[PDB]
């Protein structure tokens, strides 16, 4: 809980990714995850 956004910013990119389709999917996944977290955070506000 206490490092929710911190771990999203610093433990999200998988440095083993070496294919552009896999990379595209990961960017989409990360971005959607940030949006979900932002939605919950404003609700907490």
């Amino acid at each position: 809980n206490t490092f929710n956004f911190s771990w999203k910013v610093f433990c999200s990119w998988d440095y083993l990714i070496g294919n552009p389709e896999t990379a595209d999917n990961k960017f989409n996944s990360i971005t959607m995850n940030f949006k979900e977290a932002i939605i919950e955070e404003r609700a907490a506000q």
């Binding site: 956004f5 911190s6 771990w7 999203k8 910013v9 433990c11 440095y15 070496g18 294919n19 940030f34």
Partner: protein, 183 residues
């Protein structure tokens, strides 16, 4: 007919987490990036750099949004152009065998975009932007950056020191799993 002296290979083993056989394999990976620039005999102790453009386009880095920063951090002069020593050091730190405290230290350097020994709201803005390819709004980015500082700025100065960063990241269960390059 040899790439290295025994002493040179002993020295690379001493300063990396690689076996002698791995140093040989990685040397050929480096030489193959620019075969008209990198000599095949390193007993001459050459002073040669592979340019960043060929490093960042390697299979192991080409899809990483932080590839330019990674090469900058490990390069001799901070411009991403790499000697053999720089290249070995980069893959050594990023290998699965590197200890977590060493990795956290270099992760800190990668994400400290302005190279001031701190991760501030501006450094965080760069990190979040690259992670989402600019698909969050500037306001959306600001919230994330502010939350990270709220969560992780332990000494309450508005920015992440190395100590702030290490306290946050050494807890994270997926740091070692994701901050890893295999070669």
């Amino acid at each position: 007919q040899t790439v290295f002296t025994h002493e040179q290979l002993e020295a690379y083993q001493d300063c990396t987490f690689f076996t002698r056989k791995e140093i040989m394999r990685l040397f050929y990976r480096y030489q193959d990036l620019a075969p008209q620039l990198v000599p095949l005999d390193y007993t001459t102790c050459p002073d040669v750099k592979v340019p960043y453009e060929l490093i960042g386009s390697m299979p192991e880095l080409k899809d990483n949004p932080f590839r330019q920063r990674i090469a900058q951090v490990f390069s001799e002069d901070g411009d991403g152009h790499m000697t053999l020593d720089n290249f070995l050091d980069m893959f050594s730190v990023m290998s699965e065998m590197a200890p977590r405290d060493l990795k956290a230290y270099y992760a800190f350097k990668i994400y400290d975009f302005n190279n001031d020994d701190y991760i501030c709201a501006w450094d965080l803005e760069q990190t979040v932007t690259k992670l989402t390819r600019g698909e969050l709004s500037a306001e959306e980015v600001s919230l994330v950056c502010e939350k990270v500082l709220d969560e992780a700025d332990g000494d309450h100065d508005g920015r992440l020191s190395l100590e702030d960063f290490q306290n946050m990241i050494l807890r994270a269960p997926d740091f070692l799993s994701t901050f890893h390059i295999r070669i």
